[PDB]
Point group: D2
Chain length 395, copies 4
C-alpha cells in the first residue's frame, strides 16, 4: 500500500439518519445522496464541485430509484455532467467499498478528485410483482417486499438476517441479556454524543419544504431507548428461546454519507488541508449465514494492508448490524468495548444499508477528533458472507 500514491480525505458529511417511514421518508435515495455530497464539498476550502471527476456511490435496494442512483446523486448535488458515476452494491458494505474503489481510482492515476459514499431510502423501497410479463393463470400470487428480498434475506438459506444473528449468538455464546446490555450501552453513548453536540459537525441538517418548513437535525432512533421495554420485549425471530430483538438489532433506516478524496499532487496544487489519510483496507468473506463475523477477517486484513498493528488503533467502528455482531467480533479479535463505537452504533443510530459503510467512517473521523485519537479502523459486515474494513489516520 505504501508503494502507491497517497489518498487524502479532505471532508465528509452525512444526513441525519431517519427512521423507517419517519422523518426523511419523503426523500428519495438520490436526494439524500446529493445532500450529503453537496455538504461534504462545501467544507473543502479551495476545492470546487466542478473539480470532482468521478463518483462511486453505494445503494442496495435500487428498485424504482431510476437509472444509475450514483449519477442522480452526483447531478443532484451540482456536479458537472462530465463526472464519471458508478453505483456499487455489496449490500451493507456498499458505502465503504465505494470509498475503496474511489481510493483505488486515484491510486491508478485515473482521477485526482473523487466523491464516494452511499445512500439508502428503505422507506421508499417498493414491493415487486414478479410474474406479470408471462402471467400466472390461476392461484393467489405474492407481492415481494423489496427490503426483505434484496436487502435482508440470505439468498442461499432464504432466511432473514435476524436468523443469521441467532446463529451468531449460538456460535459465539451470547445470551439475550448480554445482547440487551450491549444495546443499552450503545444507545447511552449515542444519546450522550447527541446531547454534547458531537454529531453537529458531521451531520448536514435537512430542510423539508413546508404548513411551514421542517428542519431535521438529529438522528431519529437514539431517543427511542426505553431500557425497561427493551429488557421485557419478546424475541423477534425465535419464539421463547430467541435472543435477538428489534430493540437489540439495527432498525430499517434512511440516510446518506459522503467523503471527498484527493491525490497528493492535487492536494498540493490546490493548497488543500487534509482531514485524514487512508492507510489501507481489506475485504474478506466466508459462509453466507456467517456474514456476522466476517469483520474478524476483514479487519486484520485491513490492518496488515495499512501496515498498522491492532493495538495501535485508537478507535474502531464495528457496524452494529445486531448487538450480537459487535459482541462476537470484539470477542474474536480481542478488542475491548472501550475502543469500539465511542459515539454509539447502528443499533442506536440506524442502519440505512447502502450508506452505513460511509456513515461509520464519517462518525469515526468525529470520534478520533473528539477523543484525540490518530488511528481508526472501520469494519462492516454484509449480507452474503462479506465484510469490508478501512484504516484511516487523522491528521
Amino acid at each position: 500500500m505504501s508503494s502507491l500514491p497517497a489518498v487524502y480525505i479532505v471532508s465528509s458529511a452525512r444526513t441525519p439518519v431517519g427512521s423507517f417511514l419517519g422523518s426523511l421518508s419523503s426523500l428519495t435515495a438520490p436526494q439524500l445522496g446529493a445532500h450529503a455530497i453537496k455538504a461534504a464539498l462545501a467544507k473543502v476550502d479551495g476545492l470546487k464541485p466542478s473539480d470532482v471527476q468521478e463518483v462511486f456511490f453505494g445503494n442496495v435496494i435500487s428498485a424504482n430509484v431510476g437509472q444509475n442512483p450514483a449519477r442522480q446523486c452526483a447531478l443532484g448535488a451540482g456536479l458537472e455532467e462530465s463526472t464519471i458515476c458508478t453505483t456499487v452494491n455489496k449490500v451493507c458494505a456498499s458505502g465503504l467499498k465505494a470509498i475503496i474503489l474511489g481510493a483505488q481510482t486515484i491510486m491508478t492515476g485515473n482521477a485526482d478528485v473523487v466523491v464516494a459514499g452511499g445512500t439508502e431510502s428503505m422507506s421508499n423501497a417498493p414491493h415487486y410483482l414478479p410474474n406479470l410479463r408471462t402471467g400466472a393463470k390461476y392461484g393467489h400470487q405474492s407481492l415481494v417486499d423489496g427490503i426483505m428480498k434484496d436487502g435482508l434475506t440470505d439468498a442461499g438459506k432464504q432466511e432473514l438476517m435476524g436468523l443469521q444473528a441467532e446463529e451468531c449468538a449460538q456460535d459465539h455464546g451470547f445470551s439475550r441479556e448480554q445482547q440487551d446490555e450491549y444495546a443499552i450501552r450503545t444507545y447511552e453513548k449515542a444519546q450522550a454524543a447527541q446531547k454534547a453536540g458531537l454529531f453537529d459537525e458531521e451531520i448536514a441538517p435537512i430542510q423539508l419544504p413546508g404548513k411551514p418548513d421542517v428542519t431535521v437535525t438529529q438522528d431519529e432512533e437514539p431517543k427511542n431507548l426505553n431500557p425497561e421495554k427493551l429488557r421485557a420485549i419478546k424475541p423477534a425471530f425465535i419464539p421463547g428461546s430467541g435472543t435477538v430483538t428489534a430493540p437489540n438489532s439495527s432498525p430499517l433506516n434512511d440516510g446518506a454519507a459522503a467523503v471527498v478524496l484527493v491525490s497528493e499532487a492535487k492536494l498540493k496544487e490546490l493548497n488543500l488541508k487534509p482531514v485524514a489519510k487512508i492507510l489501507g483496507w481489506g475485504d474478506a468473506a466466508q459462509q453466507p449465514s456467517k456474514f456476522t463475523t466476517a469483520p474478524a477477517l476483514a479487519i486484520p486484513k485491513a490492518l496488515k494492508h495499512a501496515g498498522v498493528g491492532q493495538d495501535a488503533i485508537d478507535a474502531f467502528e464495528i457496524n452494529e448490524a445486531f448487538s450480537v455482531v459487535a459482541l462476537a467480533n470484539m470477542k474474536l479479535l480481542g478488542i475491548p468495548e472501550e475502543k469500539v463505537n465511542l459515539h454509539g452504533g447502528a443499533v442506536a443510530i440506524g442502519h440505512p444499508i447502502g450508506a452505513s459503510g460511509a456513515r461509520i467512517l464519517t462518525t469515526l473521523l468525529g470520534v478520533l477528533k473528539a477523543k484525540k485519537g490518530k488511528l481508526g479502523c472501520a469494519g462492516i459486515c454484509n449480507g452474503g458472507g462479506g465484510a469490508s474494513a478501512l484504516v484511516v489516520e487523522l491528521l
Copy 2:
C-alpha cells in the same frame, strides 16, 4: 498506464444472448452469470476456480434478484465462499466498468486472480408497486415496469433512451434509411459470423433440463430475425411520422451474461498460464445525459491515450449498438470506417442484455481479433445518463 502493473486476460466466455421472454427467459440473472463465469474459468489451463479472489459483476435491473447479484453469480459458479463480490451499475456500461475495476484491483495489489463481467435477465425484471407501505386511499394506481424505470429512462428528462436516439439522428443528420441500411449490414455480419462458427468458441451453450425433453440453447436468438422488407416498412418506434429510430434498427431487450478472467503478471508466471490478451488501458467519460449516444467519442480517445495507442493502430473496434444511430454517430465523430467496426455484428443484431453488454462486446472483440488476425482492439459502450466506458486490449 505503462508504469502500472500488467493485467492479463487469460480467458472469457458468454452465454448465448436470448430474446426478451425467449430462449433463456426461465433463467435468473445470477444463473446466467454463474454459467458464464464457470465456462470462462474452465478454459484456463492450470488455474482453478478456487484461485479466484475477487469478483466485480455488472447488473442494472437488480430488483427481485436477491442480495448482491455478483455474489450469487460467484457462488453459483462454484467459487469459494472466501471470494470478494461486488455488483456494479453504470447502466449499459456496467459490464465494462466491472472489468475496469477488476483490473484496478489487481493493479493496486489487492488481488492476483479476478473474475469480472456482467449479467442481465431483462425477461425477469419485475413490476413495482411503489406506495403500498403508506397506502393509497382512493384512485387507480400504477404498476411500474422496472425495465423502463431502472433500465431505459433517463432519470433527468424522464424520457426513454429511444427518444434521445432520435435527438442523435437530428443532431448528426442520420436518416431513417441510413439507420436501416446500417442495421441490415450488422445483421448480415452477425449471421455470417454465426454461420461460419465464429461465435462457437466464445459462447458456452446452455442446457435447460426438462421438467419433458431437455433443451440446449446454442446460438444467439436475435440474428435470424432479420427481414429486410419488414425492417424497411415498419413504423417509427418513438416519433410518429417523422421518426427514424425503429425497433428493428435499435437493440432489443435480451438476457445474457459474459465474464473474463484476469490475472497479475506474478500469478501468470507462477501458474505458467497462457494469456489471451493484455489490457492496455481504459477510459470513462460523460457529457449531457440526453447526449449519452456520443459519449463514446470522448471515452474512446481517452482509453487510447491511457493505452499509449493511436486510433489508427487499432485493428478492430466494438462500438456497442445501443441504436444503429449510435454506431453511425460515433463512427462519424471519430473518423472510424465501418469496415473496422463490429466485424461480427453488433447488439442491434445480437441483442443487448444491458448489464452484460460491456463484457459481452469485449468477449466478441477477442474473437474478432483472433479470426481476423488482429492485434489491437478497442471496446466502447455508451450508457444512459450521459456516460461511456472504453477499453483497449492487445491480443497476445
Copy 3:
C-alpha cells in the same frame, strides 16, 4: 291490481350506523355489517324466531373479495338457518330497495312466508384489481384498478364518473353551486337535528368492536362534519372553475347495512305479529344512463300508480341524495316541496353505502312517518346505469 295478490307486511327494520370511508366501521366486512342489521331487525319482532326466516335477498354492489354469495354470508352470520334461501342483488345504488321488492314478490307468488331483505356495503374494504395477471402484460406500466371507481361510481357506457353526470344534471335543470350548497347545509341540519333529538335511536343498531372494554359506534359518522364556511369555499370536484358539484354537496363513500323483515298476511295473524307497515306498491324505471339522476321522476309515479295512491296523499318522501342536485332536480320535475322530503336528512349528510342505501332510506322513512305522525310514505333511489327504484309504504 295489487289486490289480486297476497299482502306483504313490514314487521321490523334496523340499520347499522353509517361509517365514513376508512372510518369508524372500516374494520368490519360487508357480511358482518349485514349480519348485524339482520340480527337486529329480527330481535324487534315479538313472536317471531330467526329460524322462521325462509329466504333472504340482500343488495351488495362492490362484491370483489367478499367471498361466495354475500347475502348467504349475511344470513348465516346473523344466525339464520342453513336451510335459508339466499341471493345477492346488484342494481348498483338501488340494490337495497330492489332486494326488498324481490322479497315482497317471493311472498306474493307464495314461495315464502318470512323473508329478510335489505343491503350492505363496505366501501372501505373494496379492493384494487389487477386485471391482466392471468395472460400477462409483456412490457409497459400497468394499472391497479380501484374497485370503487370501476364497479361503483363509473357509468359503463361513457366511462364517466357519476359526479360528472351530476354536473350534467345541474346544467339540465338549472341548479347552481349556491343552490346545491344551500340544500346540502339544510339536509345536514335536518340530519343533525334528528341526531340531537334521538330520532335515529330506534332504527340504529349500535355496533360493538371487541377491544379490555369494547368500543361502541352509535351515531352516523358524517353528519357532524358539517362546516358551512369550508363547504361554500371548497373548490368543485369534477369541473375546475365552472363546476357546481362538490365533495361536500355530494354523498360520501360509506360503510353500513340495513334490513327489513317481511311476512305474509297469513303468518302475521298465525303467530299474531304487530305490523309496522304494509307495502302498497313499487316501481322500477330507467332511462338514458347519463340521466340516471332524474330516473326517480319516472320510478316514483310508477310506484304511486302501482300503489293506487296520489302524490299529494304522501306524507313523507325519501329521495336518496346521491348528490344534492339529484334531490333538487327530482323535486323540481315532480312538484314535491322540500318540506316533505328527507325530513331527518339524506345521504349527503348521513352517508351512501351504496348497496345498503335503498334499504337504509326505507328504514329512516318508517322513523320519519312515526315522528311526524304520517301514514303514507314513498322512497325513491336512483342508480348508476340510468335506473331507479321506488316503494310506497303505509304505516300501520
Copy 4:
C-alpha cells in the same frame, strides 16, 4: 297466478379457460346471448323487453351492473329494468325464477333472464392498498378462488367439498372417471349430430390488422377427452387417496345463456309461439359443505311446486359441478342415468358458473325436442349449501 312462457332461448359456445372466448367480457357474451334469443321470436321486437335479470358471480372489474351492460349491449331499450343476481353456481337459474315471478306479479310482460360468466377475465385483488402494509410480503387474491370456488366458512376449494360428497355416498375414482367418459361421449355425439346447433349462437371474432377472422361455433371442452390420459392422471385435491381430478370435474369456462319469457296475455296479444311453459321451481339449502347434494332437496321441491311427480319427467339436467355430484344426486333421488344430461354435462361441456343455470335450461329444451319428451327438469347446486331446480313442459 298467470302462466309464464319461454318463447326462445340461446347460449354462446362455452369457451375454455383463457380459451376461445377469453377476449370477450362477461357483458359481451351476455349481450350476444340476449340478442340471439330475441332474434328467434318473430312477432316480438327487442324493444318489447321490459326487464332483465342476469346472473353473474365474479363481477369484479366487469363494471356497473353487469346485467345492465348485457341488456344495453344486446340492443334493449334504455327504459329496461336490469338487475344482476348472484346465487353462485345457481345464479342463472335464480335469475329466471325472478323473471317468472316478475311476470306473475304483473310488473312485466316480456322479461329476459339468464346468466353470464367470463372466468378468463376475473381479476386478482390487492385488498390492503388503502390502509397500506408497512413491511412484509403481501398477497394478490385470485378472484375465482375467492368469490367463486371457495366455501366461505370452511375456506376450502369446491374440489374438497367434492371429495366429501364422494366419501359420503360411496363413489370411487373409477366410478367418477367412467361417468366423466360417459358424459364426454354424450357431448361428442351431439356435436357430431348437430343437436347443439339450434341452441348455440356462434360468435364472430373479426381480425382486421391483417389477421383472419375467427368464428367460434363449438363448445371447446368436449373434444379434449383422452381416456388413456383421463384414467391415469393424479388426483387434484387429495394426493394418493383422492377421487376428484380435473378431467372428471367441471372446468373453468366462459359463456352466457338467455331465455325470453312472456306473460299469458302477451303470448296471445302478439300471436307468439311458445317453446315451453314454466310449471314450477324450488330453492333449497343445507350445510354449506354439503352443497353437492342440495339438488336432492331442490328437485323434489320444484316437482311439488309444479304438481309433477318424479316418474313423469322425460329428461333431467343435473349440473355436473363434479362427476360425483351428478352420481350422488342420482343415488339420492333414485334417477337412472339414461334420462340425465342426454347431450352431455358441465364436466364435458364447461361450467361458466354465473351462466350454467341458464345454460342447462337451454340444453334441456334441446334434449326434450330431440328425445320428443314433454316434462323436463333442471337442477343446479351452488356454493354456500344451496341449489335451485326448475320444471318445464315443452309445447
